[PDB]
């Protein structure tokens, strides 16, 4: 069957820690007071929660309340533990409280206020400098959570909250996040279609932090090339074909050969034969001011089929693309 894989960094972070850290099922939730929070307006509803702008009446501060749907139980406890472990980390959303919602009778997570604007609202109109600046800020969040033994697994523009006026960023929605344990097989039904890594699309379960680096590369490609999304699949199958039209089929078959993966036979009639395209193929008069040799070299090193070959978050922070960013 498939050949096993291990992360090349932060491999054994969870193995050395006491079970209290990663055994989210044994965690005891310290319940706050639901009356401290007054709901103001509904911001949105996703698959697993409803999100509201609210006010913390004990200090008049604005907060965000995420009321969980009563679907999964193990999933709820995992999100709370991950948020508590990461609290105070660079550009990580701050969990302020956990209360029991009086109506839904489910946990409600209370977060520090952020502007009601996601990165998808701004990321197609940034300058070259601001793409570099904000990507460096996202990398600080990813290296921190990876160093803490956690993969986000849902990196996408909607999950990056930005306050452009204040040049501040937060990585949000840790509901799909998981503790990395070497040799563990994970569910491939994570991330949004356009940001899914080839490991998810070929059903390779022993993936790691590097999945977040492919999703980050998809975001960068969409920003520097002004193409939303960069890989525009009609479904999870066509998503891999769209990737193969850019990266080529030869490196795809080498990746599948290396990990001894059984590619779904559905692909035999749709994948075709494609050579790797040079990154200059995507450059045009409308995006050329966002492209540089450094941007293309950095993107090339994130968008690799082999998850073990992608830059790690710390390696990404060292790249020449960020030499222009004031630190």
Would you please indicate which residues are annotated as catalytic (active-site) residues?
Answer: 154
| Short-list 222, 205, 45, CA closest to 131 | 222
Distance CA 124, CA 222 (A): 8
Q: How many residues sit in the footprint of ligand 54G (CB under 6 A)? A: 9
Tokens representing 181 are: 């344990």
309 is in an annotated binding site: no
Q: Which residue, 83 or 256, is less far from ligand 54G as judged by CB?
A: 83
Q: Which residue, 82 or 240, is less far from ligand 54G as judged by CB?
A: 82
Task: Rule CB under 6 A: choose which of 7, 54, 64, 211 binds ligand 54G.
Answer: 64
Report the site for ligand 54G in 3-42 (rule: CB under 6 A).
Answer: none
Q: Tell me if residue 118 falls in helix, strand or coil.
A: strand
- Rounded to the nearest angstrom, the gap between the alpha carbon of residue 298 and the centroid of all alpha carbons in its chain is 18
Distance CA 291, CA 268 (A): 35
Query: Which x/- pattern over 138-177 shows residues binding ligand 54G (rule: CB under 6 A)?
Result: -----------------------x----------xx----
Q: Which residue, 97 or 173, is less far from ligand 54G as judged by CB?
A: 173
Instruction: From residue 211, give the alpha-carbon distance in Å to each of 88, 116, 196, 275.
Output: 23, 27, 8, 24
**Strand pairing category for 95-100 and 61-68:** unpaired
Q: Which residue, 171 or 295, is less far from ligand 54G as judged by CB?
A: 171
Tokens representing 266 are: 């559905």
45 is in an annotated binding site: yes
Q: Which residue, 173 or 212, is less far from ligand 54G as judged by CB?
A: 173
Task: Rule CB under 6 A: choose which of 66, 132, 307, 319 binds ligand 54G.
Answer: 66
66 is in an annotated binding site: yes
SS (H, E, C) 38-98: EEEEEEEECCCEEEEEEEECCCCEEEEEEEECCCCCHHHHHHHHHHHHHCCCCCECCEEEE
Query: Which x/- pattern over 178-217 shows residues binding ligand 54G (rule: CB under 6 A)?
Result: ----------------------------------------
Query: Which x/- pattern over 75-114 shows residues binding ligand 54G (rule: CB under 6 A)?
Result: ------------------x-----------------x--x
Instruction: Give me the residues paired with residue 41 across strands.
Output: 53
| Binding residue positions for ATP | 43-51, 66
Residues within the interface to ligand 54G (CB under 6 A): 51, 64, 66, 93, 111, 114, 161, 172-173
């Amino acid at each position: 069957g498939p050949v096993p894989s291990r992360a090349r960094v932060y491999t054994d972070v969870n193995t050395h820690r006491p079970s209290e850290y990663w055994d989210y099922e044994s965690h005891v939730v310290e319940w706050g007071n639901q009356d401290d929070y007054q709901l103001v307006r509904k911001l949105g509803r996703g698959k697993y929660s409803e999100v509201f702008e609210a006010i913390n009446i004990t200090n008049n501060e604005k907060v965000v309340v995420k009321i969980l749907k009563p679907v999964a139980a193990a999933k709820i406890k995992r999100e709370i533990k991950i948020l508590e472990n990461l609290r105070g980390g660079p550009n990580i959303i701050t969990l302020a409280d956990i209360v029991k919602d009086p109506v839904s009778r489910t946990p409600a997570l209370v977060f520090e206020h952020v502007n009601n604007t996601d990165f998808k609202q701004l990321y197609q109109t940034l300058t070259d400098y601001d793409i570099r600046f904000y990507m460096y800020e996202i990398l600080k969040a990813l290296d921190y959570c990876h160093s803490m033994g956690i993969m986000h697994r849902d990196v996408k523009p909607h999950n990056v909250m930005i306050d452009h006026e204040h040049r501040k960023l937060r990585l949000i929605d840790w509901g799909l996040a998981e503790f990395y344990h070497p040799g563990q097989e994970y569910n491939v039904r994570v991330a949004s279609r356009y940001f899914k890594g080839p490991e998810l699309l070929v059903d390779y379960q022993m993936y790691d932090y590097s999945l977040d680096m492919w999703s980050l590369g998809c975001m960068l490609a969409s920003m520097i090339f002004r193409k939303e999304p960069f890989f525009h699949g009609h479904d999870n199958y066509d998503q891999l074909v769209r990737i193969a039209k850019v990266l080529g089929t030869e490196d795809l078959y080498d990746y599948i050969d290396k990990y001894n993966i059984e590619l779904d036979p559905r692909f035999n009639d749709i994948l075709g034969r494609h050579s790797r395209k040079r990154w200059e193929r995507f450059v045009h008069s409308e995006n050329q001011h966002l492209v540089s040799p450094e941007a293309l070299d950095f993107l090339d090193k994130l968008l690799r089929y082999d998850h073990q070959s992608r830059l790690t978050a710390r390696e990404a922070m060292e790249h020449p693309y960020f030499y222009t960013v004031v630190k």
